[PDB]
Amino acid sequence: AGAKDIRSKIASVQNTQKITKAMEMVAASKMRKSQDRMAASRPYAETMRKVIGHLAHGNLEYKHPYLEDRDVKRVGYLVVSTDRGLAGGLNINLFKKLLAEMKTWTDKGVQADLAMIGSKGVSFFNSVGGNVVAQVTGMGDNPSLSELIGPVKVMLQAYDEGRLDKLYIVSNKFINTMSQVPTISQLLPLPASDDDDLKHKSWDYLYEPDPKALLDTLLRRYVESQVYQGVVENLASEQAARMVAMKAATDNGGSLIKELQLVYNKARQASITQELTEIVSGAA
Template sequence: MASAKEIKTKIASVKNTQKITSAMEMVAASKMRRAQERMAASRPYAENMRKVIGHVAQGTLEYKHPYLEVRDAKRVGYIVVATDRGLCGGLNVNLFKKVVSDVKKWKEQGADVEFCPIGARSVQFFKSFGGEVSAHASGLGDAPKLADLIGTVRVMLKAYNEGKLDRLYIVFNKFVNTMTQTPVIEQLLPLPKSDEEVASYPWDYIYEPDPKEVLDLLLTRYVESQVYQGVVENIASEQAARMVAMKAATDNAGEMIDDLQLVYNKARQAAITQELSEIVSGAAAV
């Protein structure tokens, strides 16, 4: 058994760690509220944008935009959104497992794959995983701006426009609630059609000034908005996962302190018993 002094030192060390995890839990809770507000503010725009584009994709269009054309999938691109920092439980691991599983299916069909990681952990993962990385972004902070993502997104859009990509997906953690964050893979290009029922006869929108000009701008903005929404959802998920992980670490530290305190008391009691035994033995010898 370790000496009482060693156990006492260990208890002090665990208490210091507990203070750190407790502070990190409170910081994550504060950041999570702000991240949720940003996510809630942008989510209606992103969802309505998706509905409008899905409706456009079902029309009999005068101008068929390249983003609406379905091509044979010979090359697939993934924009993978992960965190910049760790200590958030299995959030990133579950996301990467989902990506690897989906990539495996495409490779079995003979398609090549390339990646665009967003977030330091995503960049680090794909360096070790292998595969072609076309562009990357990291260090976006807790309040990312669309301008920080446009350059990275445009690289993937340019590859799609040039025919170097036939499918484009975004992968991120969708915030459900504080305890639940679900990794999802959503198709960006070609544009997914809406599930809503539309008229069976041919129809189209009336565009001003010109369908090409309007759709070029609208569909590019659509892709950018979906990537931005994925990033803010992922940040809210990160803070929630970190808060839960740090709370679990704080609770575990408390249990460990209780166990060590019990061991310390036993060691101290054994030392006192031994001292008394030695005193009694000495007295008896005299």
């Protein structure tokens, strides 16, 4: 206590409030920019998926591995996580959801395998002891496809090499500025989609050089694009969670100044009283 120490603390709580207000403004702008960079990604994936749909399960079909439901000896996971704290409950809600289902799987005697995007997940699963075969970190607020090729190349190679039997991406889904749900979704073998190419009996492509050679690259590009989309949705969700977290923290700081100042007033009055009483009652 002592009025001056309490004043020196009130000053620092006000400073903290002035910091978190700025962090909330920054996050609220980066969220808009990140969800611009988000919706700019729809066209590539849509137009590649229509092509795959026509080419592989429309009016003719191919027996490529990625498209059919072989049995499950072990399962691979691509994990999207942030590189920055203060996001709130995002990352560990996601990690608890993952762990629940990787446990469910290993109950069946199957093994699970992980690849990590972002450093928070890396540190977490290196603490808990899950297996990580590849990782990429330090993407920051500028994810790019040039950097994702590595880990998903690893997971795909290990898929068609037989060492994996199913491939998932775990990530947060930015749905509303205020709500964001952790989701696990499957991207091998390829989830069936609606709108069969019944209308496309009208055309077929001049495949050059060969259709079986093209579909094999189209599917890789598609999977890479879905991983990138997941990374960017999670990156928008990171901002949309950090901003609400800093909102809450600014209101907690503002609600704590109101107690610190009552304690300060009490100390001020006590000091005035006990000084003036010492002067008067001490003199004669």
